[PDB]
Design a protein around this ligand. Structure first.
Ligand SMILES: OC[C@H]1O[C@H](O[C@H]2[C@H](O)[C@@H](O)[C@@H](O[C@H]3[C@H](O)[C@@H](O)[C@@H](O[C@H]4[C@H](O)[C@@H](O)[C@@H](O[C@H]5[C@H](O)[C@@H](O)[C@@H](O)O[C@@H]5CO)O[C@@H]4CO)O[C@@H]3CO)O[C@@H]2CO)[C@H](O)[C@@H](O)[C@@H]1O
Ligand SMILES: OC[C@H]1O[C@H](O[C@H]2[C@H](O)[C@@H](O)[C@@H](O[C@H]3[C@H](O)[C@@H](O)[C@@H](O[C@H]4[C@H](O)[C@@H](O)[C@@H](O[C@H]5[C@H](O)[C@@H](O)[C@@H](O)O[C@@H]5CO)O[C@@H]4CO)O[C@@H]3CO)O[C@@H]2CO)[C@H](O)[C@@H](O)[C@@H]1O
Lengths: 368, 368
C-alpha cells in the first residue's frame, strides 16, 4: 500500500519506542507508520517480499541481509556523504553487499555476562570456576548461571573461545604476480603518446622544468601537474583553470592517487616529539594552512581543513580526477613497478624500443 | 641527535611553510625543527635508516612506505581514536601495512589537466583532439600541451585509461568452503557446555524466557544476554552489573557482533518515505532515544548519540565483549551456518548426539 509505512522488527526490540518515532513522523507528514513484530519475521520476509509484498522496512541483525540482497529483495540505500559521515564506518561495512549499501545500520550488539551484584559481588572471570560457584549457590536454593541454550547465538561465544569459527575471512590483497603493464590497454595508451611524439606534438626530452616554464610563460596551452605546481602559476601571468584529464578511446584518464604521508623513523630517539609535532602542530587547520600557502597540498586528510578547501574548483577537479583513478598500492613491489615502467616509457618515447618490447620487458622485470 | 627534529620532504612541496610550523613548534617547546629537501631522499632514507641514522620524520607519497615498513624502518604510529576520527578513513587505509598504521596521512594528490583560459577557453575533453589543436597553435608559435615525460607518474594516467594497471587487487572475501564448526576448539567449548549439563549446573531445556525469569527473580546469580534485556532487569528487584564474558582455557569468550539494521523492501512503493523516516527521524539523537528508552539498543551507529551512551558501564562492557568477538558475516551462507549449529548444540546438549558427531554433521551441512 502506497502512502504509508509498514515496519517489521523483532519482538525483543523496542518496538513501542519505534512506534513513537512513527507517530512523530505522521504528525509531521500525515503518513501513517505501523510497527509490527511478527514471529519468524526473518523467515517470512523472503517469502513475502519475493511475491512483491511484505513490509516497507525490515529490521534484523545484518547477518540476514546478504541473503536478502542476493535474492534481489532489498533496495540499494542512497545516503549522501554528509549522512554517511554521521555513522561509524564499520557499521556501513556491515551492510555492504557486493559493493553496495543495502541497509541503514542502527545499533551494535554483543552478549555480555550479566550478574547479580548481591549474589556474586565479584563475578567469575573464568568458565571453569562456575561449577564450584554453582555448588555453593545450590545449597542456598539458587544456581550460578542460566542462559538461553536453544539459540546458538548464546552458546557460540563459548564454542568460539578455544578456536571455533564460522567462515574464515581472507583479507584483501594485491596479487603481486599479476600486473597490467603489457596488456592491450597499456600498449594502446603508450602508443598514442609515442604517436604524438612522432607527429611532433610533443618532444621526448620534455621534463618537469621545461614543461613548467613553457606553461607558466604562456608558450603552451596546457600542462599536466598536481596541486604543488599551482603556486608558481599563481605568480605567473597565466590565467589558468584546472579540470578533468582528457579521455582516451572514450574512457577517463586514470591518475594514480598519492597520499602525502609522514613516517617516523624507527631509529629516531625523538618519537614522542615527532608524534606531538605531527598530531598537534602540522595536522591542524593552522599547520596545514602554513604549508598550503607555500605550495598547495591538494585535498587534505584533516576533515576540518578539507571542508574549507573543497569549495575551490581546483580542489574539486583534483578530487574528480582522483575518483576516476586508483589509489596507489603501498606494497614493497611498487618501487619495482615504477623503475620498470619509467624505463619502458623513456625507451619507447626515445625510439630505443618499440612500445610492445618496452612494456613486455617491464612486465617481465616486475613479475619475475 | 636527541632533543630536536629533522624532517625530510621532497623539493616540490611546501618546505618553507612546513619550516614555519617547525618555528612555532620551537617557540612553544624550545625543540628545534630542521626541514631538509635532499635529492633522492626516498632512495637515501632506506640506506641511512638501516644504519640507524637519517631524519626523524620522512614525507613521501604512501606508495613508498610499505617497502620501508617491510624493512622495519618505520615506527608504528599510535594515534588514539579521537585523533583518528579527525582524518578521513581512506587516508588511514593508505598508511596501513600488515594491519598496522605506519605513517600519518597529510594530503591527497592527483594529477589534473591545467589549461590557459586565454589560449583554450574550452579545453579539450579527449586526447584524440589534441593533435588538431596543436596544429592551430603551432602556426601561432605555441603548442597544445607539454608535461613531464621523464617520470611515469605523469604518463600513467594515459597508459591506464584503456586498461593498463599496476597490481590487481583482490577484495577481502569469506571462504565459504572453510568453516570452523568441527575443529578442536569448537569441540572443546561445546564439550564444556555439555559437561556442565551432565553435572546439573545447567539444564538442556533452558530457553530465553526461563533464564530471564530466573535471573530477574533472583533465582540465579548470572545470565548471558544482550542490551535489549536490560530494561526488564531495571524494572525487577535485582541489582545487576554487566561485564566481560568468562574466559575459557584462558582465552576470551568470542560473541558474534550483530549490527541491527533497517533494510528497505525492493518491492516497496514508499522508498522515498522510508529513506526520510530512517535518515531524518530514526537516525537522530531523539529518534534513537525513543527506541532506547523502550529496550536498550546497545552501542548505536550514530556517532553523536553513541557519545552520550559510551559513559554507561553497561555499554562499555558491551563494546569490550564486542572487541573480543567477531563481526558476523552477512553472506547468504550465514543462515545455513546458524541452522546447522542450532541443531548441533541442541542434539549434543540433549544427548541425541555426541559432541563430535553433532559438530561433524553441522560442518558437513554447512560446507557441502
Ligand atoms: O519449528 C521448528 C523450530 O521453530 C523455532 O525455531 C525457529 C525459529 O522460530 C526461527 O526464527 C529460525 O531461527 C533461525 C533464524 O532464522 C536465523 O536467521 C538464525 O538466527 C540468528 C540471527 O540471524 C542472528 O542475528 C542472531 O540473532 C540474535 C539477534 O542478533 C539479537 O538481536 C537477538 O534478537 O537475539 C538473537 C538470538 O536469539 O543469532 C540467531 C541464531 O541464534 O538462526 C536461527 C536458528 O537458531 O529457525 C528456528 C529453527 O527452525 C522453535 O524455537 C524451535 O524450538 C523449533 O524446533
Ligand atoms: O641516475 C639515473 C637516473 O637518476 C634520476 O632519476 C632517478 C630519481 O632521481 C630517483 O628519485 C628515483 O625515482 C624513482 C622513485 O625512487 C620511486 O619511488 C618512484 O617514484 C614514484 C613515486 O614513488 C610516486 O609517489 C610518484 O611520485 C610523484 C609524487 O607522488 C608527487 O607528490 C610529486 O612529487 O611528483 C612525483 C612524480 O615525479 O610517482 C613516482 C614515479 O614517477 O619511481 C621513480 C622513478 O620514476 O630513480 C630515478 C631513476 O633512477 C634522473 O632523473 C634520471 O634521468 C637518471 O637516468
Amino acid at each position: 500500500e502506497e502512502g504509508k509505512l509498514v515496519i517489521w522488527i523483532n519482538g525483543d526490540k523496542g518496538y513501542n519506542g519505534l512506534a513513537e518515532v512513527g507517530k512523530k513522523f505522521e504528525q509531521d507528514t500525515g503518513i501513517k507508520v505501523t510497527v509490527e513484530h511478527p514471529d519468524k519475521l526473518e523467515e517470512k520476509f523472503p517469502q513475502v517480499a519475493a511475491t512483491g509484498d511484505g513490509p516497507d522496512i525490515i529490521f534484523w541483525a545484518h547477518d540476514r541481509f546478504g541473503g536478502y540482497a542476493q535474492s534481489g529483495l532489498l533496495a540499494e540505500v542512497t545516503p549522501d556523504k554528509a549522512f554517511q559521515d554521521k555513522l561509524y564506518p564499520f557499521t556501513w561495512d556491515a551492510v555492504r553487499y557486493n559493493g553496495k549499501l543495502i541497509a541503514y545500520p542502527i545499533a551494535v550488539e554483543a552478549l555480555s555476562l550479566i550478574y547479580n551484584k548481591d549474589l556474586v559481588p565479584n563475578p567469575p572471570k573464568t568458565w571453569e570456576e562456575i561449577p564450584a560457584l554453582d555448588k555453593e549457590l545450590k545449597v542456598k536454593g539458587k544456581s550460578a548461571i542460566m542462559f538461553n541454550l536453544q539459540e546458538p547465538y548464546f552458546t557460540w561465544p563459548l564454542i568460539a573461545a578455544d578456536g571455533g569459527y564460522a567462515f574464515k575471512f581472507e583479507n584483501g590483497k594485491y596479487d603481486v604476480k599479476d600486473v597490467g603493464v603489457d596488456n592491450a590497454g597499456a600498449k594502446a595508451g603508450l602508443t598514442f603518446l609515442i604517436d604524438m611524439i612522432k607527429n611532433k606534438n610533443m618532444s621526448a626530452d620534455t621534463d618537469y622544468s621545461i614543461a613548467e616554464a613553457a606553461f607558466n610563460k604562456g608558450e603552451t596551452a596546457m600542462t599536466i601537474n598536481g596541486p604543488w605546481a599551482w603556486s608558481n602559476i599563481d605568480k605567473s601571468k597565466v590565467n589558468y583553470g584546472v579540470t578533468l584529464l582528457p579521455t582516451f578511446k572514450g574512457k577517463p584518464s586514470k591518475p594514480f592517487v598519492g597520499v602525502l604521508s609522514a613516517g617516523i623513523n624507527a631509529a629516531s630517539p625523538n618519537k614522542e616529539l615527532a608524534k606531538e609535532f605531527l598530531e598537534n602542530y602540522l595536522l591542524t587547520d593552522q599547520g596545514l594552512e602554513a604549508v598550503n600557502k607555500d605550495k598547495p597540498l591538494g585535498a587534505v586528510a584533516l576533515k576540518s581543513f578539507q571542508e574549507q578547501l573543497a569549495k575551490d574548483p581546483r580542489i574539486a577537479a583534483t578530487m574528480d580526477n582522483a575518483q576516476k583513478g586508483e589509489i596507489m598500492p603501498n606494497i614493497p613491489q611498487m618501487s619495482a613497478f615504477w623503475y620498470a615502467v619509467r624505463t619502458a616509457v623513456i625507451n619507447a618515447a626515445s625510439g630505443r624500443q618499440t612500445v610492445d618490447a618496452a612494456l613486455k620487458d617491464a612486465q617481465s622485470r616486475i613479475t619475475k
